[PDB]
Amino acid sequence: IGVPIKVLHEAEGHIVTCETNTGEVYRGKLIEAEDNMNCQMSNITVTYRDGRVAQLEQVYIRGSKIRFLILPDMLKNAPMLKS
Amino acid sequence: EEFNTGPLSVLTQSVKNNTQVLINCRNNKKLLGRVKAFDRHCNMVLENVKEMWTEVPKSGKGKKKSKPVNKDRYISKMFLRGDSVIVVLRNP
Amino acid sequence: LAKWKTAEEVAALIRSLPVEEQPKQIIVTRKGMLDPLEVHLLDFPNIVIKGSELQLPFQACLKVEKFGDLILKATEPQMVLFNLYDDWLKTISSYTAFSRLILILRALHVNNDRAKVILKPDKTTITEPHHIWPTLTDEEWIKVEVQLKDLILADYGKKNNVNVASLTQSEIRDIILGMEI
């Protein structure tokens, strides 16, 4: 379990966003983030490829279908500059 | 032992005799050439390959009116990564 | 003298042409030509000299005014260059361009003036000075090709004591190429 998965381990309970394989992007606050990048998130807005906005208070996205994950720069400093 | 009776016998019987194989790849380019080697993933290093695919001139008129043309290019020695292999075929 | 003269002239042309553009296969329409070639082009063993079981009516060019007039009026012997496909290489394949060209040549050989009026489906189409055949697109080319093919087959049936519907596509192809079924 390398350093990026430890970073998303240190993004638990924080404001996080995930862009998905189909193109939807999901901006909310995470609850659980596992080894295989599965993310159960909360208070979250869904933005489709339509450009529309939706909201619901929880979601659970599969890890391989994640394209990427917007993390907050709370984690940009500590402590992984030793990497 | 069972290296020579499995479904990769098409490849290990074609690399022994150094005969040419036809490969329909994933992006529908067709590789004709002799296998220099292969492995589990069908990572076939090939010699003297004709890579034959199809094009259209892609609306050279402005009215989207043309017929597909057969293009090919020669590659001397290639290392085809074997995920993009769909089918390998020994010659008749 | 004449056989070895034509052999040495073609050999001189091959010599003048750079090696890259030099052929490796030479097919003689006349069977009584290959042997003097075999003698004379010995210096270039990389070429393969063979005869052609099929004969192409290239006298059609002489019958055509342009080439015939140029040949008759050319006082000094020369090595004139031309391109028998006007611009068809960019439009169609080389094989089909050759098929169209030989169809036109055979149609002209069997009936020059009729073949000329057919080659010009209308009197408005023209051929540029740098061109030889009228500038036609795919549809007109196909229509005139079938017209010339049917004219050739009509002449063959008239002259050979046979009908036109009794020949398969293999026979039509070999006949237009110059073969005897």
Binding site: - | - | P23, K24, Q25, I26, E53, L54, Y95, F98, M179
Partner: protein, 223 residues
């Protein structure tokens, strides 16, 4: 060379010298030894051989007819079951009650004339003579001798055999006499010396079913 001249036939002498100029006998023997060693290397795993060794043959050994020496040495990694010395063409051979680790191969070229062009007998006699010979040094008593008659282009071997060696040597010798560059050069030189050539089958005059090749990459001209 190994040629023996009975009487002084100066014209034939000069002709043979011209043909065999440039150590051609040595070149042929060396090429044959190397090709056989390459084949043995190819089939080492199947034959359970340890290694193939190019024994340092004397440079003149090719035409040292009175004596001989070993050419190739097969190291086994095991004790094989060898056979009594029988002709290469002897399909039925019995097993000799012995086993060996080192197996030697000898190659003997001969220039057979009309009288004595029997490769089978010549190889048999030479093997049964050299093996018992006091001046012939061989790594092991058990081995094989392969004789090639150049003049009549014949081949045959006699000595002991171990499983697989017989088919291997048979097919190796066949493909040898088919496609060895040294023997090819010898045959071409003999043909040139005799001024005897072979004809050709004209040419497949382009037909309606063959014209399709006209538009290949090769540049073609119609005259």
């Amino acid at each position: 060379t190994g040629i023996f001249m009975h009487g002084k036939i100066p014209t034939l002498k000069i002709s043979l010298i011209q043909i065999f100029r440039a150590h051609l006998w040595q070149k042929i023997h060396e090429s044959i030894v190397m090709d056989l060693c390459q084949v043995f290397d190819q089939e080492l795993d199947a034959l359970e051989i340890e290694t193939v060794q190019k024994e340092t043959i004397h440079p003149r050994k090719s035409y040292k007819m009175n004596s001989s020496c070993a050419d190739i040495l097969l190291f086994a990694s095991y004790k094989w079951n060898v056979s009594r010395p029988s002709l290469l063409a002897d399909s039925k051979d019995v097993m000799d009650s012995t086993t060996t680790q080192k197996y030697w191969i000898d190659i003997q070229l001969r220039w057979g004339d009309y009288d004595s062009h029997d490769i089978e007998r010549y190889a048999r006699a030479k093997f049964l003579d050299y093996t018992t010979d006091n001046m012939s040094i061989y790594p092991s008593p058990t081995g094989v001798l392969i004789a090639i008659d150049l003049a009549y282009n014949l081949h045959s071997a006699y000595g002991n055999w171990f499983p697989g060696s017989k088919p291997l040597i048979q097919q190796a010798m066949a493909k040898i006499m088919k496609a060895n560059p040294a023997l090819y050069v010898l045959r071409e030189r003999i043909r040139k010396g005799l001024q005897l050539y072979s004809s050709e089958p004209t040419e497949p005059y382009l037909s309606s079913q063959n014209y399709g090749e006209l538009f290949s990459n090769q540049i073609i001209w119609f005259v």
